[PDB]
Subunit: 199 residues, 2 copies
């Protein structure tokens, strides 16, 4: 990607739906860091509309995930969680935020998850119940989510999520993608600001 599909935007709307220095100020340094270092590169996530770019964690964010070791295993908590009201809740495990804050070191990178203008337009239309409108002035690509992490590559989506995606309300399961996600999530867990699952 060059000046044609640059600089990057940050969709405020589609961004508010993906999250548990101001927006403008943050966007300014991303685009700067991108023009500089003509070596930073984009990696296709999975869909032709999802792309990732990895930059240094200039905001000091803690990682959203950490390794499970024999010594910290007892800190895990688990429970049935629905990311949003219409989703069926699913068994999930995590390390509490309080532990991550006192243990962890500022993640090495920020994984910027980018969506195409067209995809943002389609998803904003569905969520908003408005028309699918594409502004040719709008950036070709925009940041919809940021994940702090030490690995310079996309981490697999949770296993349960892959199964969730096969439910009618509608496609077959990629069994190898599933095996791979399990391999990773067997020995790592997300961070969540929740000390207990009991209600």
């Amino acid at each position: 990607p060059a000046p044609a599909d640059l600089p990057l935007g940050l969709d405020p709307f589609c961004y508010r739906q993906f999250d548990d220095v101001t927006k403008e100020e943050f966007l300014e340094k991303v685009n700067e860091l991108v023009t500089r270092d003509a070596g930073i590169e984009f990696f296709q996530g999975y869909a032709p509309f999802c792309r990732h770019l990895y930059i240094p964690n200039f905001v000091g964010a803690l990682p959203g995930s950490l390794p499970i070791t024999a010594d910290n295993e007892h800190l895990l908590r688990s429970g049935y969680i629905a990311r949003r009201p219409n989703e069926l809740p699913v068994l999930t495990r995590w390390f509490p935020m309080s532990y991550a804050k006192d243990a962890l070191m500022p993640a090495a990178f920020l994984d910027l998850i980018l969506y195409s203008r067209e995809q943002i337009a389609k998803e904003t239309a569905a969520e908003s119940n408005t028309a699918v409108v594409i502004d040719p002035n709008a950036p070709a690509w925009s940041i919809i989510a940021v994940k702090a992490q030490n690995e310079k590559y996309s981490l697999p989506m949770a296993p349960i999520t892959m199964l969730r995606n096969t439910l009618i309300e509608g496609v077959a399961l990629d069994r190898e993608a599933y095996k791979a996600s399990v391999a990773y999530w067997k020995t790592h867990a997300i961070v969540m600001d929740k000390e207990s699952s009991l209600e």
Copy 2:
């Protein structure tokens, strides 16, 4: 529910929670005695006309398969990806290990006795061998094929994940569209109870 001629209940030993220190003869005898004594013991239709079940007092002191999750024991839970069979995909599961469970489990309030018709027992015993099925007309009409120690007077919901895996023919299982209301019900139960499993850590 049920006809005097459809009593006493039998017990297919080639199938049968753990029951200890009692013979299969004595067990069946006490089950039948408990049944004919208390007119309040109800039989509940299973799903297909060949399954049925009833709840009786837990006279063998069998321990349940799970424990309640409380504020004091929540941190003792362990979790990991487990496959119930070598040909199945592993799924996230949580449990209380024996280091806690051995000092928490107590005899359950009831036994959910699962019954199968004489017909279905002959059929599966034969299918298990593919042998010509021989039915003994004098065999009990209903026989106990499973016994579940539990504290609740209702069918314990299967695990939420089991319900999901059953919607995947490729990995199942029915293939039928998930009954979302049954799933929610199952989740409500499993949010506050966890199975017991002899595994101290998830790491391998």
